[PDB]
From a paper:
Because the [name] genome does not codify an adenosine phosphorylase, one alternative to fulfilling this activity is 5´-deoxy-5´-[name] (E.C. 2.4.2.28) (MTAP). This enzyme catalyzes the reversible phosphorolysis of 5´-deoxy-5´-methylthioadenosine (MTA) to free adenine and 5´-deoxy-5´-methythioribose-1-phosphate (MTR1P). The observed overall fold of SmMTAP is similar to that of members from NP-1 family of low-molecular weight purine nucleoside phosphorylases (PNP), which consist of a central β-sheet distorted barrel surrounded by α-helices, as observed in other MTAPs from human and bacteria. Furthermore, a comparison of the KM levels reveals that [name] MTAP can use adenosine with the same efficiency as MTA, which is one fundamental difference between [name] and its host and reveals a potential target for schistosomiasis drug development.
The mutant [name] also does not present any large structural differences in comparison to the wt SmMTAP structures; the consequence of this mutation is that the capacity to form a H-bond with phosphate/sulphate in PBS is restored. An interesting consequence of the [name] mutation is the presence of two water molecules near the atoms OD1 and ND2 of T87 mutant occupying approximately the same position of N87 side chain. The bulkier group of N87 prevents the binding of water molecules at these sites. A disulphide bond between residues C233 and C242 was observed in the [name] structures of S12T, [name] and S12T/[name] mutants. SmMTAP structures displaying this SS bond also have the gate loop locked in open form. In general, residues 229–242, which comprise the catalytic residue D230 and the gate loop, are disordered in subunits without ligands. Comparing the BBS between bound and unbound structures reveals a large movement involving residues 230–232 (usually residues 233–241 are absent in the [name] structures), and residue T229 presents a different side chain rotamer.
Residue numbers in the entry:
A (entry chain A), B (entry chain B): 3 to 291
C (entry chain C): 3 to 236, 239 to 291
Amino acid sequence: KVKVGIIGGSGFDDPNLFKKVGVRQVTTPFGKPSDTLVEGFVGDVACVVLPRHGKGHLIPPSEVNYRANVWALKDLGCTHILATTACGSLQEDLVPGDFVVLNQFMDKTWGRENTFYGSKPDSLKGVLHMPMAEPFCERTRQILIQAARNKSINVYDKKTMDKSACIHPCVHAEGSAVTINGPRFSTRCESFIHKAMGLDIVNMTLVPEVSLAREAGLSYASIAIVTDFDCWKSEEEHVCVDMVLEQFRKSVVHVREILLEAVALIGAEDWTKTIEANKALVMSSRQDL
Amino acid sequence: KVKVGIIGGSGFDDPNLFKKVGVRQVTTPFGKPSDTLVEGFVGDVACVVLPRHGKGHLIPPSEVNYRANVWALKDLGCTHILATTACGSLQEDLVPGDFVVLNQFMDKTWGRENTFYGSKPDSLKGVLHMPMAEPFCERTRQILIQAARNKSINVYDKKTMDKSACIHPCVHAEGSAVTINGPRFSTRCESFIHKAMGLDIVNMTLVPEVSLAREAGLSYASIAIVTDFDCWKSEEEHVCVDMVLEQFRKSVVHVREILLEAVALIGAEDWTKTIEANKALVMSSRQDL
Amino acid sequence: KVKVGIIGGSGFDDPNLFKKVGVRQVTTPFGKPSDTLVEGFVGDVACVVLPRHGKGHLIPPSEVNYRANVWALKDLGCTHILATTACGSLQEDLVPGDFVVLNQFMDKTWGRENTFYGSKPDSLKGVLHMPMAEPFCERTRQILIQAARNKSINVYDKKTMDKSACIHPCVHAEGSAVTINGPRFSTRCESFIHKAMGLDIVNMTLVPEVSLAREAGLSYASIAIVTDFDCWKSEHVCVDMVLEQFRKSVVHVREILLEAVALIGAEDWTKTIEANKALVMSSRQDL
């Protein structure tokens, strides 16, 4: 009944989550996806993994074909999409090695194809105005957090827990990302303003991925990996990048376990009313109709 | 002498403002307008109307040819442009069913052709840097406000009236819009930040329409219709939607009355000096000259 | 060992900084630069100048080919780029006639080609994520500031000096620019928000020029001229006073630039140039 797609970011350019059956090349009305897809199973649940940047990480965030990636997963029968993203921290209690199950974002991207619908021949005919106040699938968000608990990963909820209960590495139960266009990182001025706005992390790939998943009627949740992009500040930059990469490798191992546990938890529940509600929200958001 | 163009937004896809005298299928140096232009009279005042999204509302906000629409109206001899827009509220005193005669905006659009001038073969030769501190025609703004008073619609002016005088439904005598690119609505995170910046309403179509009107030497004023896009929060979304659409239908009836009265009020005054000043501001903003 | 490129903004459409020894009518793998590049010398220091908007100021900010301008200077062997920009003030102590040696910015541009690298067939292959926390070359920033001191122009550093040391016209030793896409100026609503964010000046041309210079392994520094774009509040006499002051500001910036080229050539830059190139290599994520 359910099928989980996985969009792997940095650290997942060469997917190896499960015992691979075969790789699959697909075409899409909006172009080719970033790479071939790896098809397999976790339990009795079909799973398919797609590297966001391609196998060698040769595609930058602004040039990723998010429409083709999301539609390819849709056409393969996916009902859910779990995604990863490496990010920088903007707040004290989010430190390298932590994870964030995001629930909000502020969009600073531009020049990317961010909708399936329009009046151009390269899009589906129609005008679609999708509500995005809470842009993720809340059921799928809580499954990622429960998967972390099941794998004995600390979970921190700043609305219900003291800052001393912040035990790293932890999964932050909530968080907002500012998605910048890249490829450059932010200036200190820009980072200060983003921090003053209360944003938790900065990344480059969440939007329009999260928006297109909802346009496709798919349940989408993202888990962000906090890393460190400031090794240029240390005196021994070569040692710093080695230490940050080693911690990032350990973070990828944790996220791999969370993703595998989440796929099983998704396949254990019924999603009939949620999938139907995902499809109806698309229909009701059609202004031309 | 004076000739009033009207750009009808949502709810005005079939404007139906006056008896059609001429129907003009127009071509501009910047492409085709959203639809055929309908020419006629309101009283003794010549008037031209076009629907921003075309018949059937097939054109989303980001793909409207704002240059062709404004240029076509200018080409037919318009001296003024009155425009409508359906918007969502960001502040407590702006309630669905109110109207706003906008006087300010913050631009968050991208990827739209926003100027007639440039160095490319498809633009007018020159470099134009237009002042936009107060981006509307103030005379024409006050015409819309007087038109509302003449049609016995409450007018609330926060500059001179207390919040106790805010009697709904009312026309707000001033207001600022954040224009997002669409087609999606804002996240809660984005709406919270726009509200913290003091913006009154959110829409998707004001920019670059207001900018191009001033580039063309035209007097531009907008009247926003506050409606409700958050029907998903409701227990029975089917019931709220019908209530919101019924309120929106009443709103377009009153906006039609305001537009027709505003056209008559424009025609009752001399605009020689204002038109002359509109044209002179374009010439004085040419940096290449 | 050094060669200084100069990108002249408004007021420098016909630069004329030195005797023209030669001209270079060139194009790049990313298109045509804004105009012919003019080669010469300041003392014994090689210099190249190009007008950002081309002669006659026919190219608006959003259509300037920043990639081609930076690449053409790099192609001629430039090690540094000094750039000028005319800007408006967002804060009370930045008054028309002042200058700013920028050290920060907030980017509100869009639709401009802003990187040499990517997966497109016509770009340099690879994924380049350059750090930009402090986006200018700091050594070159201090050269511009020292050049102003050497030309008898007041310098104001709000980190160490009370506001009583802000004697106009002055070079502000640091400052942030919000770069808007243009061509229109900001609404009062937008200006109020930019001011509340603490930004010092507003312009239209700094980004992506500063980003691409770092991608190219070049030392880049910008000197802004504060002028006044709000004479519509008055009329033609207001404009004439603002234009005369801007003319004087252009003369001052000309003296600053010529002294800066001499100060750059008087020092060794082997280490800094090698660091510029090593930062490009270490920012390649595909490697």
